Amino acid sequence: GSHMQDPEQLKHCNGILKELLSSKHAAYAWPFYKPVDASALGLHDYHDIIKHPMDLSTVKRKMENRDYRDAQEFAADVRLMFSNCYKYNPPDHDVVAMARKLQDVFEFRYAKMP
Amino acid sequence: GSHMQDPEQLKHCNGILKELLSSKHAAYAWPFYKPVDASALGLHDYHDIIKHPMDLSTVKRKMENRDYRDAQEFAADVRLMFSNCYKYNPPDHDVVAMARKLQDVFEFRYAKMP
Numbered sequence A, B: 001g002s003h004m005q006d007p008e009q010l011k012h013c014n015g016i017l018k019e020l021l022s023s024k025h026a027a028y029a030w031p032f033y034k035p036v037d038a039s040a041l042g043l044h045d046y047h048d049i050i051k052h053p054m055d056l057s058t059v060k061r062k063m064e065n066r067d068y069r070d071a072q073e074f075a076a077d078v079r080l081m082f083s084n085c086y087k088y089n090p091p092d093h094d095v096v097a098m099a100r101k102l103q104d105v106f107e108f109r110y111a112k113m114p
């Protein structure tokens, strides 16, 4: 059920999303900007291992289209994106190091939810 | 709606929870074993800042009582526990360093969901 705080909480989520896409974090956010193109990257097992792909452009479209009804739904998608990276790649891969840094940006600001 | 995979996914979640409570991680998991006793710790603003307290003993009771119906519900509570730590404490506090390490244990194993 919708709560009167959901619009303002979704604004905070949109602020976080804007930050994740901003130049400040681009050195480690770039692998998450668009859907993984498994074929182009030679990752021919990606869709056998990752059942629910997610990326920041998809989160942005869902925010713009008012798909997310509350902050928890938004956060589950952002976390799904990171989890897919931790599931598919070896833990010492540079893409995992980038994911951990971007997730730290996300989690610390999500925790500041007004 | 319940899925036939929910029991096995909840078993994986229970395995993670057991690991988080195990001696292997006790050096950094201990602040999360029981509900924050704000009065005992002198944290007299804790319940003004943290609207939804969560801790591993509460997660365990909810698992034992079949409160969680799926893995996503379990994961939201574990993540809520970490988020409360990131929201209340300064980011350089030792309890935050412990939270980050325990959350890394959680997220990497949650990502291995069968």
Ligand SMILES: CCCn1cnc2c1c(=O)[nH]c(=O)n2C
Residues within 6 Å of the ligand: A031, A032, A036, A041, A084, A085, A088, A089, A095
């Ligand atoms: C930097 C390696 C190519 N690459 C780009 N994006 C990626 C990857 C990858 O190997 N694994 C991933 O999960 N993603 C998101």
Ligand SMILES: CCCn1cnc2c1c(=O)[nH]c(=O)n2C
Residues within 6 Å of the ligand: B031, B032, B036, B041, B084, B085, B088, B089, B095
């Ligand atoms: C180690 C400091 C006391 N202490 C114990 N548990 C805590 C804290 C704290 O200051 N902040 C917390 O969030 N928790 C979970």
